Design an enzyme around this catalytic site. Structure first.
Site, PDB file in Angstrom:
ATOM      1  N   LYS A  46       0.821  -1.210   0.000  1.00 49.37           N
ATOM      2  CA  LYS A  46       0.000   0.000   0.000  1.00 49.37           C
ATOM      3  C   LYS A  46       0.864   1.273   0.000  1.00 49.37           C
ATOM      4  O   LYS A  46       2.066   1.194   0.265  1.00 49.37           O
ATOM      5  CB  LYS A  46      -0.974  -0.038   1.184  1.00 49.37           C
ATOM      6  CG  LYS A  46      -1.967  -1.200   1.109  1.00 49.37           C
ATOM      7  CD  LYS A  46      -2.967  -1.185   2.256  1.00 49.37           C
ATOM      8  CE  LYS A  46      -4.008  -2.284   2.079  1.00 49.37           C
ATOM      9  NZ  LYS A  46      -4.993  -2.314   3.194  1.00 49.37           N
ATOM     10  N   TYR A  65     -12.295  -3.334  -4.657  1.00 53.25           N
ATOM     11  CA  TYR A  65     -13.061  -3.296  -3.412  1.00 53.25           C
ATOM     12  C   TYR A  65     -14.581  -3.326  -3.637  1.00 53.25           C
ATOM     13  O   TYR A  65     -15.329  -2.670  -2.905  1.00 53.25           O
ATOM     14  CB  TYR A  65     -12.680  -2.057  -2.591  1.00 53.25           C
ATOM     15  CG  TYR A  65     -11.253  -2.035  -2.084  1.00 53.25           C
ATOM     16  CD1 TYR A  65     -10.879  -2.771  -0.960  1.00 53.25           C
ATOM     17  CD2 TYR A  65     -10.282  -1.259  -2.716  1.00 53.25           C
ATOM     18  CE1 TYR A  65      -9.570  -2.745  -0.485  1.00 53.25           C
ATOM     19  CE2 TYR A  65      -8.970  -1.226  -2.250  1.00 53.25           C
ATOM     20  CZ  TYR A  65      -8.623  -1.971  -1.134  1.00 53.25           C
ATOM     21  OH  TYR A  65      -7.328  -1.942  -0.670  1.00 53.25           O
ATOM     22  N   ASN A  87      -2.233   0.036   7.161  1.00 52.75           N
ATOM     23  CA  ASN A  87      -1.717  -1.311   7.419  1.00 52.75           C
ATOM     24  C   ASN A  87      -0.799  -1.863   6.316  1.00 52.75           C
ATOM     25  O   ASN A  87      -0.730  -3.077   6.097  1.00 52.75           O
ATOM     26  CB  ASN A  87      -2.863  -2.285   7.746  1.00 52.75           C
ATOM     27  CG  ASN A  87      -3.776  -2.551   6.556  1.00 52.75           C
ATOM     28  OD1 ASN A  87      -3.740  -1.845   5.548  1.00 52.75           O
ATOM     29  ND2 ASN A  87      -4.604  -3.581   6.675  1.00 52.75           N
ATOM     30  N   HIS A 145      -1.720  -5.543   1.475  1.00 52.91           N
ATOM     31  CA  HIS A 145      -2.917  -6.340   1.215  1.00 52.91           C
ATOM     32  C   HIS A 145      -2.535  -7.714   0.671  1.00 52.91           C
ATOM     33  O   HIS A 145      -1.560  -7.849  -0.071  1.00 52.91           O
ATOM     34  CB  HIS A 145      -3.843  -5.627   0.220  1.00 52.91           C
ATOM     35  CG  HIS A 145      -4.834  -6.538  -0.441  1.00 52.91           C
ATOM     36  ND1 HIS A 145      -6.046  -6.862   0.130  1.00 52.91           N
ATOM     37  CD2 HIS A 145      -4.781  -7.209  -1.617  1.00 52.91           C
ATOM     38  CE1 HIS A 145      -6.701  -7.686  -0.669  1.00 52.91           C
ATOM     39  NE2 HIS A 145      -5.955  -7.914  -1.735  1.00 52.91           N
ATOM     40  N   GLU A 151      -8.295 -11.004  -8.394  1.00 54.36           N
ATOM     41  CA  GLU A 151      -7.350  -9.904  -8.178  1.00 54.36           C
ATOM     42  C   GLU A 151      -6.169  -9.921  -9.152  1.00 54.36           C
ATOM     43  O   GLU A 151      -5.789  -8.874  -9.679  1.00 54.36           O
ATOM     44  CB  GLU A 151      -6.865  -9.879  -6.723  1.00 54.36           C
ATOM     45  CG  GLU A 151      -7.901  -9.329  -5.745  1.00 54.36           C
ATOM     46  CD  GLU A 151      -7.561  -9.587  -4.284  1.00 54.36           C
ATOM     47  OE1 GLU A 151      -8.490  -9.548  -3.450  1.00 54.36           O
ATOM     48  OE2 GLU A 151      -6.377  -9.827  -3.963  1.00 54.36           O
TER      49      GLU A 151
END
Lengths: 152, 152, 152, 154, 152, 154
Positions: B12, B52, B115, B118, B129
């Site tokens: 990220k 998402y 965080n 992913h 994905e």
């Protein structure tokens, strides 16, 4: 502010003696926690008696104070969201035998009598320990350049 | 075929900003997983919305997409036996507070909204994905020189 | 403009095979250089012939091209003040025997024909190499959160 | 214990070194080498302290900016002990200008520009005496014996 | 065969005592050199007198033999192209004061009397030292899975 | 010195662990923990030795392949000493099946499949006694005192 929670971390005489000061600080830095206080010192008997005041009538008190006075310690204050609880997780269980690999005690020590490190067990204890070990003006305030990427 | 399972891993924008790209790739390399796809990119809004989709009706959706768009990401595909499941274990819990020391999130971050990484939660999600982020020609097939020492 | 200098770095097929991708990226990240381009690819013969044009009349040319084609490579673009010159210093001498410990080649490889990594030898070469391996849209522009602490 | 093995040097991690999370890594390098920790504190250096530290550069055109920058962020002040700490400490740090610093050194591995060179070390024993006295009070310096002393020095 | 050159590396008592065995082996492994012999032992006075035979009439001989006998050593044989000369470079100068950062002695020790490690200074010395410290059947022959990526 | 702190365990780096360059990393983890090195040798384990080591599995259908594989490449045989080395050594190694091994452990960080699980450690003190006696001669075990002993054990 929740992100401004602070905890007291002390590297014990065996941690200093076995050359673990750098490794320990690195763990907290890489996590994203911010350094606010750092001090190399030999803790006096008076300070240690007050730090372990809840255990003054226990039979191991004399030996505990004597040992923590036998060598220099690294006293630290770290800031971050849930730093008290998370700090304790990073340290691992107080007894190194139960500490998991990946934690400080899990990776670096064996016996509870020589468990290299201490961290505040609660916010209440943190406030008490920071005030005891550090003077207010020894605590430095600054903003990390990575603040916006560590916190929302 | 079981050893040829593939998962999608994305570093990220905060992972890139805090200089964790090399550290994260090293974790997967040393484990024995094989690199299949790797690219440095700024993800478009359309791509992120599709990534998402299961969270489109959530109150965080707009800010979550905007943030994943705020900086460049590192998109990756890794191959190995149970790479989806064990990859998630290597990353740690989605919330860094619940992530154990030794895991990527446990060692390197603090807050759930920041965080760093992913990973695909299932084989079905992985396939979706990978196809979303990567063209088939971008996925490279080769045999590791250590294949016989990683797998029977 | 001086701080915006860019260089091309390629991890050779032996670098990928021996699991050094993460380690190499970490070296550039920790130094303070900014990632601009990154992709995992199998380089075509045409691309390699054009990359090594200055060596087309050399006796090694055919075997050198064939080998760089034998496995996938990691193509990279890094940005920073004197990134071309200092990048070469970080890589070490072309021949690993002359490479010093602390450098990438000095630490991780032995033979010149298997020297894990390539770096642009000049600003002119860098511009040619970047344009050869990367499309303009693949190069990502962003500002590091630590920019003010790396540069005046 | 030999007096020669008890030489002291002043090492300071600059505000950029603290900001970029290099404190632990820097201390580790001195620890793993065999040098002993004597002094360590986290502080914001006052303007008065910095003016006295850079007293030789007071008439220079960029003196105002140098004091201002070194005051903008906190520093880690350190004292390390060992045989020829001053000289070898400088070697471990690398050249003052990071462009000339070699891989393996602190500046060689971690920084790029001379204005943001993450760290300082005493250039001589005379400078070390001055810098330690200026930055540290005698009480802040802790004397202890390393358990590995017999295996570091004959 | 040039790629099959071998050298003798000994971790001295201070290297063992200061917990550097793992770090040292890692340096040689990551370089691409192949382990052929490894032994944990206390060297007898007879063996050390023969090892330092060229210095038997020098006034420091008694103290040198006594010290090398005072603790256990790790005796090693490593194989690779120019492993003798390159091994010495990896170790750094015999006097740690002149050893560069990035080398074993440069990173890990201070004084020449406690320089943690020894390596053969020539192929001639290597043959003599390997034959003295190791029995022929203690030397193991195998092919690394990464051989083709380390050597042409 | 307390007898409890002098417990011994047998740790073996398997052929895949040697092949994948994990010898130094594995030894480092035991060293940094505070455990003391007692035995260390690089060897190709003979078929006779492996048949005696896996004596409980002699009637199993894949016994022939197990002995053949463990003989195909060299191993690093080790003996480590410390308080509860056997138990905590197993914890440091992680679960035998790498799929269930946690990050931070040796198997958790470095391997994937149970047939190629890089390492072995004694499952009990009784097993340790047997394994050390089988793999090592008494002369090969070296007894020394760590300079850090007083800081590892009270």
């Amino acid at each position: 502010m929740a992100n401004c929670e602070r905890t007291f971390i002390a590297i014990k005489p065996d941690g200093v003696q076995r050359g673990l000061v750098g490794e320990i600080i690195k763990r907290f830095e890489q996590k994203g926690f911010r350094l606010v206080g750092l001090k190399f010192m030999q803790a006096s008997e008076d300070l240690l008696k007050e730090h372990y005041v809840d255990l003054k009538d226990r039979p191991f008190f004399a030996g505990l104070v004597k040992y923590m006075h036998s060598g220099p310690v690294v006293a630290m204050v770290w800031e971050g969201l849930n730093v008290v609880k998370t700090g304790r997780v990073m340290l691992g269980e107080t007894n190194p035998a139960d500490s998991k690999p990946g934690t400080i005690r899990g990776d670096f020590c064996i016996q509870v009598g020589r468990n290299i490190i201490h961290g505040s067990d609660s916010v209440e204890s943190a406030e008490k320990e920071i005030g005891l070990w550090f003077h207010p003006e020894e605590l430095v305030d600054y903003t990390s350049c990575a603040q916006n990427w560590i916190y929302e």
